[PDB]
Scaffold this active site. Sequence first.
Site, PDB file in Angstrom:
ATOM      1  N   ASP C  94      20.727 -23.501   4.917  1.00 45.01           N
ATOM      2  CA  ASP C  94      21.497 -24.052   3.817  1.00 45.01           C
ATOM      3  C   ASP C  94      21.823 -22.945   2.816  1.00 45.01           C
ATOM      4  O   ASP C  94      22.952 -22.923   2.302  1.00 45.01           O
ATOM      5  CB  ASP C  94      20.786 -25.221   3.189  1.00 45.01           C
ATOM      6  CG  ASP C  94      21.601 -25.959   2.154  1.00 45.01           C
ATOM      7  OD1 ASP C  94      21.842 -25.357   1.087  1.00 45.01           O
ATOM      8  OD2 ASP C  94      21.964 -27.164   2.418  1.00 45.01           O
ATOM      9  N   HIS C  95      20.887 -21.992   2.638  1.00 42.14           N
ATOM     10  CA  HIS C  95      20.983 -20.933   1.641  1.00 42.14           C
ATOM     11  C   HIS C  95      21.820 -19.766   2.150  1.00 42.14           C
ATOM     12  O   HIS C  95      22.070 -18.812   1.409  1.00 42.14           O
ATOM     13  CB  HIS C  95      19.598 -20.564   1.099  1.00 42.14           C
ATOM     14  CG  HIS C  95      18.946 -21.701   0.370  1.00 42.14           C
ATOM     15  ND1 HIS C  95      17.731 -21.575  -0.257  1.00 42.14           N
ATOM     16  CD2 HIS C  95      19.301 -22.993   0.203  1.00 42.14           C
ATOM     17  CE1 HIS C  95      17.390 -22.738  -0.797  1.00 42.14           C
ATOM     18  NE2 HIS C  95      18.348 -23.596  -0.559  1.00 42.14           N
ATOM     19  N   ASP C  96      22.252 -19.852   3.409  1.00 47.57           N
ATOM     20  CA  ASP C  96      23.287 -18.975   3.930  1.00 47.57           C
ATOM     21  C   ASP C  96      24.690 -19.586   3.701  1.00 47.57           C
ATOM     22  O   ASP C  96      25.697 -18.885   3.644  1.00 47.57           O
ATOM     23  CB  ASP C  96      22.942 -18.657   5.370  1.00 47.57           C
ATOM     24  CG  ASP C  96      23.696 -17.495   6.000  1.00 47.57           C
ATOM     25  OD1 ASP C  96      24.731 -17.037   5.416  1.00 47.57           O
ATOM     26  OD2 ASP C  96      23.238 -16.997   7.073  1.00 47.57           O
TER      27      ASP C  96
END
Lengths: 465, 55, 105
Positions: C94-96
Amino acid sequence: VNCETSCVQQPPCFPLKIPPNDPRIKNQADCIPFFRSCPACPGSNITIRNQINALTSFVDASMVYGSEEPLARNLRNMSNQLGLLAVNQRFQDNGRALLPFDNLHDDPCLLTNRSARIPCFLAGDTRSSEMPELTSMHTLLLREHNRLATELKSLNPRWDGERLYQEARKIVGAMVQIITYRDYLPLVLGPTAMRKYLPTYRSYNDSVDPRIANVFTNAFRYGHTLIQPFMFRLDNRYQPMEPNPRVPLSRVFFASWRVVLEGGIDPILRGLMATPAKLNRQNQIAVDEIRERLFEQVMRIGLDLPALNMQRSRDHGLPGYNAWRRFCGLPQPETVGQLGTVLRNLKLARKLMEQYGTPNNIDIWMGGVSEPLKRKGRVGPLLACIIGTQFRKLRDGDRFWWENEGVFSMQQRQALAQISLPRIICDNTGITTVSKNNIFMSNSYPRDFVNCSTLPALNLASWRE
Amino acid sequence: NFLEHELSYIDVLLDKNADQATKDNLRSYFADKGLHSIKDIINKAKQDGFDVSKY
Amino acid sequence: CPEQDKYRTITGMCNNRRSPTLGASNRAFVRWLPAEYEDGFSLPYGWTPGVKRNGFPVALARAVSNEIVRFPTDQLTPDQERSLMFMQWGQLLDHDLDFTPEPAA
Ligand SMILES: *[C@@H]1O[C@H](CO[C@@H]2O[C@@H](C)[C@@H](O)[C@@H](O)[C@@H]2O)[C@@H](O[C@@H]2O[C@H](CO)[C@@H](O[C@@H]3O[C@H](CO[C@H]4O[C@H](CO)[C@@H](O)[C@H](O)[C@@H]4O)[C@@H](O)[C@H](O[C@H]4O[C@H](CO)[C@@H](O)[C@H](O)[C@@H]4O)[C@@H]3O)[C@H](O)[C@H]2NC(C)=O)[C@H](O)[C@H]1NC(C)=O
Ligand code: HEM
Ligand SMILES: *[C@@H]1O[C@H](CO)[C@@H](O[C@@H]2O[C@H](CO)[C@@H](O)[C@H](O)[C@H]2NC(C)=O)[C@H](O)[C@H]1NC(C)=O
Ligand SMILES: *[C@@H]1O[C@H](CO)[C@@H](O[C@@H]2O[C@H](CO)[C@@H](O)[C@H](O)[C@H]2NC(C)=O)[C@H](O)[C@H]1NC(C)=O
Ligand SMILES: [Ca+2]
Ligand SMILES: [Cl-]
Ligand SMILES: [Cl-]
C-alpha cells in the site's frame, strides 16, 4: 480551527461525531479528529473535488527509494561511490543496518517511550515507523539494496555510485513485483479472480492508465481486517521472546524504540512468519486495538480505524456499495432480503440496513469487507474486482515491468524468477529458519519451516561486463 | 531539515585524510541543498536541534 | 521527456511517453466513477446536519463501527491459511502505491 484538538466543523476539519451510547467515548461533545485530504484544486467552485497521490502508483519500491527528488537523494549514502542507501549512524541490530533517523517537528515516535528518546525512521514513504512490523519490512529492503550494490561492485569494479544505486534499485523493484504478483495477489483474490483480473502478462501497453483510482485508496484497506491485536516476537528457537512476547498494538504504533532497544528486526520477522493472520469474518471484522485504541499513545484520544475508513470515503466523494457493484458488473441488492443473499448473511444485511437505510448508501470499505470471501481468497467479489482491476493497470501500464521486453535480459529474468521473501530474510538477518512454500500461507512452526541453506540465492552472474 | 546521518558527512569533510573526490562530492550534495561552506553546514545542523559542540 | 532512458525516474514522470504524468507523484487520483458529494462538487456526505444521502440519513462512521465492526477480541479467529506476513506485505505494498496528503495544522 486546529483539527487535532478542535471539534468544530470548519475546513479542513471533518471530525467524526460521537453516537449517543458510545462504548468508549462517554462524552458526546468529544469527537474523533479528522483532516480532509488536500484538494487537487484548492478553493475551486468549478472543479469536482479530487484528492492527490503523493507517491508513484507503480510497483517500483518507492517506499524504499522515495517518490520526490530531494528525499531520494537524502536516503542515499553520499560519502562514497558504492551506490548504498543511508543507514543509521548511532544504532545497529547485531552488526546489521537500521533505517536512518528522521528529523520531524512534532515526532510521534518520541511520544511512545519518552525516556528512550528514539525518533522516527526515514524511509521512502513517511509511514515507515507506524508499526515495528512495517519498520522491519522497510529495514529488510534497505539491507537488500545494500547487499545487491555490494555484490554488483564485486561483479562490475568499474561502475560508479550512480550505476550501482540504479541497478540495485531496479532489482529491488523487480523483487517487489514478483513477490506481489506471484505470491501475494493470488492469496488475496483467489484463483478465479486472479485468472479474471490478472490474465497472463503479454507486453507493456502504453494505452493502459497506471494511475491509482481514488476508490482503491479506500478498498485496499480491506487489509485492516487481517490485523492481529498483538505484536509477536520470537527468539531463535521460535519461542516467545522475553519479556513482552505479545505486546498490545496500542503500545507499538510509532514505537520505533522497540526496534532499536528491544532486540532488532529478527524477532519481529519471526513473529510475522510463525503467527496466523486474523481471519475476516462477518461478525469479526476488526479488532479493538485499531477500532478503539489507534495511536492512543501519541494523540489526545484513541482513533477508530474502521470509522476513519468510512469518514475518508465520504471525504473523497466515493459512490456507495451498489454503484461499485454496478461498476464491477455484479448484481445490486435493493432490499434487506436481496442484500441477505449477496452477503450470505441475513443478520448482517439487517444490521447494514438499520445503519444505512439502502444498500446504495453503504460505504465502500464497509460493504467490501462485509462480502463473503471468494474460495481461497480474502476478499469478496466487489473488492476482488477493484483490487484486481487496479493491479492489472499497475502491471500492463508500467513501461519498466520486470517481464517487459528490454527491461531485463532473458538470463536476468531467469535469475529473478528464483527470488522469494524467505530468501531475502535469510540474506539480510540473523534468522536461519524461514517459512517454506508460500510465505503468506505458511504460518506454523516447525511444520511450515525450512533451513536457509535449502533456498537458492539470487545469482547475479548475468549482470556482468 | 537536517538529518542525523548527514552529521557523518561533516566528519568526512573534516578528515584531512579523506580524498578530494569524496569531499567535493559531499560539498556538491550540500550546495544542492543551499549550504555552501562547512560553517553553513554546521550552522544548519545546530539550528535543526543537533549537537554540534564537537566542531 | 527523454527518448533514451534505462531507469525509472524517482517521481514516475516519463513512464508513459504520451502522457508523462500518469503514475507520477503529486497528481490527482483517477476517477473510475463520478464523485458523490453533498453539494455535488465539494462537501462530504455527513457535513450538513439533517442533509440526506439519496433519501436516507447519513449514518455516523463511529455508529457504523460500533454496530457492525465491534466484536470481543477473545473470540478472534486465526486464519489457518495465512501468516501475519500476509497482512504486513499488504500494508508495505500500500505504501508503494498511494499516500493521500492532508494539511498540516
Ligand atoms: C491496450 O489497453 C487498452 C486499454 O485496456 C483496458 O485496460 C486493460 C488493463 C484491460 O483491462 C483491457 O481489457 C481494457 O480494455 C485497450 O484499449 C481498449 O480497448 C477496448 C476494446 O476495444 C475499448 O473499448 C471500446 O470502447 C468503445 C468506446 O466506448 C468506451 O468509452 C465510453 C466512455 O468511457 C464507455 O461508456 C464505453 O463502455 C467504453 O468503455 C466502444 O464503442 C466499444 O464497444 C463497442 O464495440 C464492442 C466490440 O464490437 C461491443 O461489444 C460493444 O457493446 C460496443 O458496441 C468498446 O467498449 C477501450 O475503450 C480501449 N481503451 C483505451 C484506453 O483505448 C487496447 O486494446 C490494449 N491493447 C493491446 C494490444 O492489448
Ligand atoms: C499496523 C497496520 C496498519 C495501521 C496502523 C494502519 C493505519 C492506517 C491509517 C491511520 C490510515 C489513515 C486513516 C484515515 O483515513 O485517516 C490508513 C490508510 C490506509 N491503509 Fe491502513 N493501516 C495498517 C495496515 C494496513 C494494511 C494491512 C493495508 C492493506 C493490506 C492497509 C492499507 C491502507 C491504505 C491503502 C490506506 C490509504 C493510504 C493513503 O493515504 O492513500 N493498511 N491506514
Ligand atoms: C556509507 O558507507 C560506508 C561504507 O559502508 C559506511 O561506513 C561504515 O560505517 C559503520 C558504522 O559507522 C562502521 O562501523 C564501519 O567501520 C564503516 N565501514 C567502512 C567500510 O567505512 C558509512 O557509515 C555509510 N554512511 C551512511 C550515511 O549510511
Ligand atoms: C522505555 O524504554 C526504556 C529505555 O530503553 C526501557 O528500559 C529498559 O527496560 C528493561 C526492562 O524493564 C531493562 O532490562 C533495561 O535495563 C532498561 N534500560 C534502561 C536504559 O532503562 C523501559 O522498559 C521502557 N518502558 C516501557 C513502557 O516498556
Ligand atoms: Ca510506487
Ligand atoms: Cl500512518
Ligand atoms: Cl493531539
